[PDB]
Enzyme design. Structure first.
Site, PDB file in Angstrom:
ATOM      1  N   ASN A   1      43.841  52.012  34.821  1.00  0.00           N
ATOM      2  CA  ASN A   1      44.592  52.967  35.623  1.00  0.00           C
ATOM      3  C   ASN A   1      44.507  54.363  35.047  1.00  0.00           C
ATOM      4  O   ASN A   1      44.519  55.343  35.797  1.00  0.00           O
ATOM      5  CB  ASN A   1      46.053  52.556  35.721  1.00  0.00           C
ATOM      6  CG  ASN A   1      46.223  51.165  36.242  1.00  0.00           C
ATOM      7  OD1 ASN A   1      45.914  50.882  37.397  1.00  0.00           O
ATOM      8  ND2 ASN A   1      46.713  50.277  35.395  1.00  0.00           N
TER       9      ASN A   1
ATOM     10  N   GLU B   1      23.689  38.930  42.689  1.00  0.00           N
ATOM     11  CA  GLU B   1      22.662  39.617  41.922  1.00  0.00           C
ATOM     12  C   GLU B   1      23.184  40.129  40.590  1.00  0.00           C
ATOM     13  O   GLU B   1      22.573  39.872  39.548  1.00  0.00           O
ATOM     14  CB  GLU B   1      22.097  40.768  42.730  1.00  0.00           C
ATOM     15  CG  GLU B   1      20.817  41.280  42.160  1.00  0.00           C
ATOM     16  CD  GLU B   1      19.725  40.251  42.215  1.00  0.00           C
ATOM     17  OE1 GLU B   1      19.498  39.581  41.191  1.00  0.00           O
ATOM     18  OE2 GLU B   1      19.092  40.112  43.280  1.00  0.00           O
TER      19      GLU B   1
HETATM   20  N1  GTP Z   1      45.790  50.190  39.596  1.00  0.00           N
HETATM   21  C1  GTP Z   1      46.932  49.638  39.981  1.00  0.00           C
HETATM   22  N2  GTP Z   1      47.673  48.909  39.082  1.00  0.00           N
HETATM   23  C2  GTP Z   1      48.837  48.344  39.463  1.00  0.00           C
HETATM   24  C3  GTP Z   1      49.288  48.487  40.755  1.00  0.00           C
HETATM   25  N3  GTP Z   1      50.456  47.830  40.864  1.00  0.00           N
HETATM   26  C4  GTP Z   1      50.752  47.273  39.673  1.00  0.00           C
HETATM   27  N4  GTP Z   1      49.760  47.593  38.794  1.00  0.00           N
HETATM   28  C5  GTP Z   1      49.666  47.176  37.394  1.00  0.00           C
HETATM   29  O1  GTP Z   1      50.214  45.888  37.236  1.00  0.00           O
HETATM   30  C6  GTP Z   1      50.601  45.729  35.891  1.00  0.00           C
HETATM   31  C7  GTP Z   1      51.844  44.857  35.762  1.00  0.00           C
HETATM   32  O2  GTP Z   1      51.800  43.726  36.601  1.00  0.00           O
HETATM   33  P1  GTP Z   1      52.591  43.793  37.989  1.00  0.00           P
HETATM   34  O3  GTP Z   1      51.636  44.214  39.069  1.00  0.00           O
HETATM   35  O4  GTP Z   1      53.750  44.744  37.861  1.00  0.00           O
HETATM   36  O5  GTP Z   1      53.144  42.324  38.299  1.00  0.00           O
HETATM   37  P2  GTP Z   1      52.248  41.040  37.986  1.00  0.00           P
HETATM   38  O6  GTP Z   1      50.838  41.446  37.664  1.00  0.00           O
HETATM   39  O7  GTP Z   1      52.305  40.124  39.177  1.00  0.00           O
HETATM   40  O8  GTP Z   1      52.977  40.337  36.749  1.00  0.00           O
HETATM   41  P3  GTP Z   1      54.520  39.933  36.896  1.00  0.00           P
HETATM   42  O9  GTP Z   1      55.364  41.182  36.897  1.00  0.00           O
HETATM   43  O10 GTP Z   1      54.902  39.048  35.742  1.00  0.00           O
HETATM   44  O11 GTP Z   1      54.714  39.174  38.180  1.00  0.00           O
HETATM   45  C8  GTP Z   1      50.856  47.130  35.366  1.00  0.00           C
HETATM   46  O12 GTP Z   1      49.970  47.379  34.307  1.00  0.00           O
HETATM   47  C9  GTP Z   1      50.517  48.053  36.510  1.00  0.00           C
HETATM   48  O13 GTP Z   1      49.786  49.155  36.046  1.00  0.00           O
HETATM   49  C10 GTP Z   1      48.547  49.219  41.660  1.00  0.00           C
HETATM   50  O14 GTP Z   1      48.949  49.352  42.807  1.00  0.00           O
HETATM   51  N5  GTP Z   1      47.365  49.795  41.274  1.00  0.00           N
END
Ligand code: GTP
Ligand code: GTP
Ligand code: GDP
Ligand code: GDP
Ligand code: MG
Ligand code: MG
Lengths: 427, 426, 53, 135, 429, 431
Positions: free
Chosen positions: A196, A244
């Site tokens: 990110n 590929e």
């Molecule tokens: N690039 C990007 N990263 C995201 C986005 N939404 C969440 N993240 C990343 O997801 C990571 C944390 O996990 P979450 O998406 O909050 O939830 P999860 O992966 O399902 O894990 P849990 O909270 O335990 O359920 C963080 O590092 C965020 O940066 C997004 O819309 N875009």
């Protein structure tokens, strides 16, 4: 030729939520489910005038899943495709890999099995997840385990979101990421890193959005995945499939990590001033200031590269630009790869989205490489796992869940062997 | 879906529980009659967490009120939203504890706790997927501390899996009502360290501090302190009730903030709290929120944070904002004040965003800091406890009831070994 | 680019509107005004609420 | 990686003709060991079969020599042209810098609620410990 | 053919503001970026109907740069090429060479890299800086150092603005100029001096504007630059490119400092009254009262000379005039240079800008010569450098900024060696 | 971008800052309520140096008032442009120093300085790139001198790279308000010479003299002296806030005027200043500006620079001006009256131009001379300090507080060695 895409995690289905918006817009499918045959790779056509995606959004918190269920894509996003649990893993790899994954995986597996049976020319799977979380990492590793033992020989791309070095949303995400990688070693076929932080950099640099949200991140990630699946979808002068990158970018069975990049990401206004030609976008796709992963390939050596091209691209100047890159010495390849490139050309220019911030361009490039700066990333991530595990911090959560320390020690030693792998292969 | 069973003990618990249910029922649009009167649809799908549909749009709170004097019951029914509770959930003694922790824990619990346990057990199986419990009580009085403490031990014995919060105000030598405050506080803390999942320590001294310096109120009566605590409670639970860019439940918070099983005493702050004389000069940016979050004068505990080290911290943001700014501000505060953070845990800051601000606001925040400055509060209590226990003053009120001296020594030892381990990790 | 400019301008206008709305609400806030009418009780005209008095 | 002589097209693949305009990579072009030595030349014929230098999974066998740590470019021994632009979170004079947040300071610690103002005392002896908080 | 221009400093980009106005008026480009093919050596035709110049303004203070961004040439001058820092170097070569240079120069040169990549037939780079300031000296030198290590043999024409002998705006400018020249020696291919009191004298005497500002000076400098790139831009009877001054004015790898001169700088009615022809403008380009540097070549010996001619000039009369100059003994050459001239002719007359003070003229001459009056200038500057250095005045600024005294000593002694060399070359033996 | 954080100490400091913020707000066009209502868009782009947008064109200053008695704060609030300061920036005690440097530096400072440091640090990290801090205070009073001096020391400990200006008023015996003025000023200057980056020495004697002679006002009360000082400060900082043909920031002026780290006490002057009855007769040219700049009766320090040598000097011009005339005026004033300029530094005159005039004029100028005639005022102070310390008068007020006599001895020694260093840098030889 059909490819089914699974989204495991709160980040995963938010990425899919922008990705599927782009797919329906690119194939002209209205959100209620029907157009006003290229769609066949994504949208199964049921009955008459109806198109249902080949996907599964699966998560543990019901909140974002039924947010999808109640949005405008109630009719497009199908009912049983949106799997949702009842309680979260809560940033806990153990909870998401041993307690709750055991109840969600059989349902997800026997759903996706009948999706594959619906399919006829299955190209492969591609997974979307962030390894920082608990849902994306825990049952993500379990699903990839059972997917590998069920099909195996089919390709499984993985577009993962790793934790950034200095900016972070959680604390235990080093543990989650390390234990996630330790299974992503022998389970995925090609893994693509997507940090990110580097995307925040890109939005700041080129789109000059001083205050982006996750949506703008999701939108240009969708640009990337569309740009490397467009060869399957539309005809090109030199098409390249999804099986590929399997062959052309993974020299060794345990080094499958890719530094992705893309160009031109450009604003609506800078587009007027700049001419986008094939030479400059091939140059701009190689600068570290346009990479999707916060690292530096100048610190390392390129192992191989892939170059997806879209739009108005003729073969002479993609051949000229790759030649120029070869003669330049700001970048250098390993000494065991004389032929280090793979081009691929597709005719369709990338589409724009209403409400998006990207301009309409003639041509674009999605460069997927393989280097040793990935060994740099794992080391820096290895250090901050070494700090927290030196004092036995947060370990009681996992052990109280029910796991043991063999997984901790073997995951750390497995990474150590991986550092030796990068150091020796690159020699 | 994920459920919160709320529990209030004693006079303090009832009053802050009153304000809490006023604010929550308002943001979910529930009228003082008990019927839905909101406008958006976004409010309906996440009220099962707190309410239960009774009869044709009648939502009653999933609360349990336990106490020992009817004055609390009259003060409950006196205010508005006073007839929205359930008289069956008014489980309640008749005698009164009266600043006696043993009376709250041995003599009155023996006949009160069975009925409370029956009520909470029926209230627990009334929901399908229970998330955890919420407990609001005091550590000075008797009927709040002792009776609530016994319910804590019983509940953790019956349902040892679910989450558990404890909002406990602690007595201070700077604002002190009674003189047996250390005797109650030490024993209650001594029980909380083995039974409670995590505790968010409030204090009336810091609350008066906030209302005098930041708010510049003239007469900050208890109603305002209860509302500030209520603002904290709504902030800690916003993630379950509203969708956002990044959700974080109670369990996700406890995992990211508790590195060790005994290190679960957090200091809490809440922003924005600006005086109405200085509201014309404010700007509304997450810079302006985080400057008030990390400010030491905005903690709701009486512990100077920069006397020690932040172990972990968390920020819960509400409102339409940009993650980029949220995540980089956390990046800056961690990198500049490099000495005030612990060294062997990088990225000490958990963050989460929920797109729905509280009613009438556009952007708010809540801070949860697990620091090692909390051992200042406990040393400040333990020294007065020792000062009294040397001469055995006010001991006959307890030992004449069944309690013996080894409970007090055990209270001293766990208090001391706790403070010793915080001082170690500093 | 013109569309993006228009969207940005509308967003800024609405941000200013919400800003002023919050300002007004929290200035007329019952706390910042210290309203003793909050001390009134529901079940009488004489007895007052114990906390907000 | 090495770029081999094309013998017909290298006249068109000169770096200057490709708009490189910098000092080009001739590392890639000296490693060939052509006959003439320049990019216009003929390679040397090779005979026999190549034995395995490396062990399995890409690890050099003990006998063969290698450069100690050659997969990377360390900052002490890298040249000046191989320098990258700094990424976002590092402060740079080009992009604006958001503010930092600093731990505040609670008021002057007294026996009552701390404030930010000192008062005149009625009693002042060096050991006074005697205040008047109510106003 | 293309030649890209980099402007380093508050003087650099004001000079650029004049120069690019001149270029747009020469190629008929409206300020919004499109015409209503010789432009291709300065403006790259982006897409369809748009020209973005091959220049980079770079500066540390954001003031003048975003002033440009708000000015008339908003749309023409491109968004990302104008590099602007956040805080100045503040008349401090050390600050501009170690503290802020090391963070701005990489972005600068990675912009230049893709400019050169867009380029096709690059002649060379040309740099505009004033060595009196902090930025144009410090990161000017840093940029030239890294350009010389990244490109090496390409031409880098440096039109530098040295401090004037008596007119001075700064105090530490001797230190700045010495420490800048110490690297300008071995990194610049050909350097051209441009002092300020010389141009003040020209505008006061010939152009008779009794109260000029920096803008009239910048207009004259732009005229000079246009007159020495007009051979690339427009076709001529005898055109001469940028790579040649490299060859034909620098006899030794350390003697590249060019006295510039221009004629006729004539006002609007002096012009009406006077009759203009090649002989008298060739005479006028040689007298010290028409040079761009406050020095006197009567005291020195011309080592070489280059003469660009513009307009209604035929080779016959330029040959006749050069012959007469060579036969007359008012000016003398070094003995080992018997062919001390290099003529070049271009057809297009120098254009005029509305608001410019120069009258429109049928022909003009721009001389880039070489002499030992520059060896006089460097000694005059070394004087007031050693004055301030004997007491170690102002040195604490630099040393606390990150240099040490060894660099001061080596710069001083390097200029001393250059003085000895300028003495040795003029000797006949 | 570049940021100036303003600090005001004491009563004189507070009122100086009141007039200064009035002038700055008027220059940038914000109304006394605190909202922008100007016309030209040159005013919006450089108010980040001094203000912060609150809500819809609401700009509050980046200032920190500091005092010891609420009378000064209320006098600030009561005046016009008194409702634009944010009440959080009003840190103030309740005891009062009472012209006691010891009280300002040891008893009340020890517990007021941490709160004022919190406030100043908050307002320093509220911005991106600090240019520096600018403190206004006196050397006669206690709550300004001692407290402000301790603040300066702590700030130099915390942030050692950003710039520091001290506008200090010094006592001079012809107008002597207090009796302990030397006891205060000596210690304050001994601390300044190792903490402050540069100092501008004002003086009420010079201000009164100027208002009598040049302006010819009938009753020149402290309001007009404050306005003169504020004009000086605005002319100092005009370069940051407005574009020009030759800019010069505070760091640039410091590096061009300070040839040695301890020689940073300047004397200031402002032009033009004439009566409304005598403005009809005089001409208005850049020579007319410079003849009044360099005139020795225009310096705002009570020291004749003709009695010493100019080490360096700087001029900041405001208004659309011809750089040719600027440069040649500087050149001839350097060359003609050449004995007053030191020898071992050629081209002593740094100059800068900005194109926006101060409010009410078309052209103006500010002069900052680092001369060696300031050792005159330092000796005039040290001689009274000796006269008092010989008999140990008023000494108990400090000695019974924690201070000792060696503090006074060290202050004396540092003052004397500073005047010695100024003397021999004046009398140094060229080669
Ligand atoms: N690039 C990007 N990263 C995201 C986005 N939404 C969440 N993240 C990343 O997801 C990571 C944390 O996990 P979450 O998406 O909050 O939830 P999860 O992966 O399902 O894990 P849990 O909270 O335990 O359920 C963080 O590092 C965020 O940066 C997004 O819309 N875009
Ligand atoms: N000939 C000429 N010289 C100029 C012009 N503008 C500024 N200068 C010179 O620039 C020198 C001072 O440096 P500046 O250009 O003002 O600023 P800088 O070079 O960027 O250095 P900094 O002040 O540290 O930023 C002085 O010697 C001026 O004579 C101009 O328009 N024409
Ligand atoms: N913040 C707050 N504090 C309270 C409230 N009621 C009581 N207290 C504090 O709690 C202490 C007395 O606790 P008490 O109500 O007697 O506990 P209980 O008898 O067990 O319910 C006193 O020191 C009060 O300051 C309240 O409504 N809000
Ligand atoms: N120029 C100017 N001087 C002042 C002002 N107020 C006080 N002074 C001078 O400051 C000196 C004493 O300063 P003082 O009032 O004690 O500073 P304090 O410590 O803040 O009280 C006296 O000689 C006054 O002449 C003012 O508003 N303007
Ligand atoms: Mg999740
Ligand atoms: Mg400059």
């Amino acid at each position: 030729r059909e490819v089914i895409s699974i989204h495991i995690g709160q980040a995963g289905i938010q990425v899919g939520n922008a990705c599927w918006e782009l797919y329906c817009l690119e194939h002209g499918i209205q959100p209620d489910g029907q157009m006003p045959d290229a769609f066949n790779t994504f949208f199964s056509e049921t009955g008459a005038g109806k198109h249902v995606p080949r996907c599964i959004f699966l998560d543990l918190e019901p909140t974002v899943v039924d947010e999808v269920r109640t949005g405008t894509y109630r009719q497009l996003f199908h009912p049983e495709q949106l799997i949702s649990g009842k309680e979260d893993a809560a940033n806990n790899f153990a909870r998401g890999h041993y307690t709750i994954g055991k109840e969600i995986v059989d349902l997800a597996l026997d759903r996706i099995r009948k999706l594959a049976d619906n399919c006829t020319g299955l190209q492969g799977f591609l997974v979307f997840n962030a390894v920082g979380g608990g849902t994306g990492s825990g049952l993500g590793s379990l699903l990839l385990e059972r997917l590998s033992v069920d099909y195996g020989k089919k390709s499984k791309l993985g577009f993962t979101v790793y934790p950034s070095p200095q900016v972070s949303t959680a604390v235990v995400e080093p543990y989650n990421s390390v234990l996630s990688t330790h299974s992503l070693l022998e389970h995925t076929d090609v893994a693509v890193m997507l940090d990110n932080e580097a995307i925040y950099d890109i939005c700041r640099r080129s789109l000059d959005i001083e205050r982006p949200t996750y949506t703008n991140l999701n939108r240009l990630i969708a640009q990337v995945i569309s740009s490397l699946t467009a060869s399957l979808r539309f005809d090109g002068a030199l098409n390249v499939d999804i099986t590929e990158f399997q062959t052309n970018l993974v020299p060794y069975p345990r080094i499958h990590f890719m530094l992705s990049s893309y160009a031109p990401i450009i604003s609506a206004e800078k587009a007027y001033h700049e001419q986008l030609s094939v030479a400059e976008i091939t140059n701009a796709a190689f600068e570290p200031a346009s990479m999707m992963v916060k690292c530096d390939p100048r610190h390392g050596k390129y192992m191989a590269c892939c170059l997806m091209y879209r739009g108005d691209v003729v073969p002479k100047d993609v051949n000229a630009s790759v030649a120029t890159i070869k003669t330049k010495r700001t970048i250098q390849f390993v000494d065991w790869c004389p032929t280090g490139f793979k081009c691929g050309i597709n005719y369709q220019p990338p589409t724009v989205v209403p409400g998006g911030d990207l301009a309409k361009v003639q041509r674009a490039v999605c460069m997927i490489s393989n280097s040793t700066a990935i060994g740099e990333i794992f080391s820096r991530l290895d250090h901050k796992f070494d700090l927290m595990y030196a004092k036995r911090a947060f370990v009681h959560w996992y052990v109280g869940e029910g796991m043991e320390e063999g997984e901790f020690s073997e995951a750390r030693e497995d990474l150590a062997a991986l550092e030796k792998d990068f150091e020796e292969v690159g020699a | 879906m994920r459920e919160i069973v709320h529990i209030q003990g004693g006079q303090c618990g009832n009053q802050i529980g009153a304000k809490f249910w006023e604010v929550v029922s308002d943001e979910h649009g529930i009228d003082p009659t008990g019927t839905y009167h909101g406008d958006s649809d976004l409010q309906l799908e996440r009220i099962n967490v707190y309410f239960n549909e009774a009869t044709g749009g009648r939502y009653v709170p999933r609360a349990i009120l336990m106490d020992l004097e009817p004055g609390t019951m009259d003060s409950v029914r006196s205010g508005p939203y006073g007839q929205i509770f359930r008289p069956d959930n008014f489980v309640f003694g008749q005698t009164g504890a009266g600043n006696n922790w043993a009376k709250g824990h041995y003599t009155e619990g023996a006949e009160l706790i069975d009925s409370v346990l029956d009520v909470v057990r029926k209230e627990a199986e009334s929901c399908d997927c229970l998330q955890g419990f919420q407990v609001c009580h005091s550590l000075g009085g008797g009927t709040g501390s002792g009776m609530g403490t016994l319910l804590i031990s019983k509940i953790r014995e019956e349902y040892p899996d679910r989450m558990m919060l404890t909002f406990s105000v602690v007595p201070s030598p700077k604002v002190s009502d009674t003189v047996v405050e250390p005797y109650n506080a030490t024993l209650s803390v001594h029980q909380l360290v083995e039974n409670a999942d995590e505790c968010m320590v409030l204090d009336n001294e810091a609350l008066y501090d906030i209302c005098f310096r930041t708010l510049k109120l003239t007469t900050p009566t208890f109603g305002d302190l209860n509302h500030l605590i209520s603002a904290v409670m709504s902030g800690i639970t916003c993630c379950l009730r509203f969708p956002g860019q990044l959700n974080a439940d109670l369990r996700k918070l406890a995992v990211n903030l508790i590195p060790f099983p005994r290190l679960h005493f957090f200091m809490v702050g809440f922003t924005p709290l600006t005086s109405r004389g200085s509201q014309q000069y404010r700007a509304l940016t997450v810079p302006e929120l985080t400057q008030q979050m990390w400010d030491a004068k905005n903690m709701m505990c009486a512990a100077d944070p920069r006397h020690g080290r932040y172990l972990t911290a968390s920020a819960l943001f509400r409102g339409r904002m940009s993650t980029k700014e949220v995540d980089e501000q956390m990046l800056n505060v961690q990198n500049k004040n490099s000495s005030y953070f612990v060294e062997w845990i990088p990225n000490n800051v958990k963050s989460s965003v929920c797109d729905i601000p509280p009613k009438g606001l556009k952007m708010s925040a809540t801070f949860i800091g697990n620091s090692t400055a909390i051992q200042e509060m406990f040393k400040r209590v333990s020294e007065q406890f020792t000062a009294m226990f040397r001469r055995k003053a006010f001991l006959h009120w307890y030992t004449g009831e069944g309690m013996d001296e080894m409970e007090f020594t055990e209270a001293e030892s766990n208090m001391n070994d706790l403070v010793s381990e915080y001082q170690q990790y500093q | 680019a013109e569309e993006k400019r228009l969207r940005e301008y509308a967003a800024k206008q609405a941000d200013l509107a919400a800003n002023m709305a919050e300002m007004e609400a929290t200035i007329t806030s019952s706390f910042m005004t210290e309203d003793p009418n909050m001390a009134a009780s529901s079940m009488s005209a004489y007895r007052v609420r114990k906390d907000h008095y | 990686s090495r770029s081999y002589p094309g013998e017909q097209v290298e006249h068109a693949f000169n770096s200057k003709r490709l708009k490189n305009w910098e000092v080009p990579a001739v590392d890639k072009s000296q490693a060939i060991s052509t006959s003439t030595g320049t990019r216009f030349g003929t390679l040397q014929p090779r005979s026999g079969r190549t034995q395995f230098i490396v062990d399995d999974n890409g690890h050099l066998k003990s006998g063969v020599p290698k450069l100690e740590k050659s997969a990377f470019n360390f900052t002490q021994t890298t040249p000046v042209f191989m320098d990258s632009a700094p990424r976002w979170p590092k402060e740079n004079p080009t992009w604006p810098k958001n503010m930092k947040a600093t731990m505040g300071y609670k008021g002057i610690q007294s026996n009552y609620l701390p404030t930010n103002t000192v008062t005149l005392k009625a009693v002042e002896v060096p050991g006074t410990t005697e205040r008047n908080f109510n106003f």
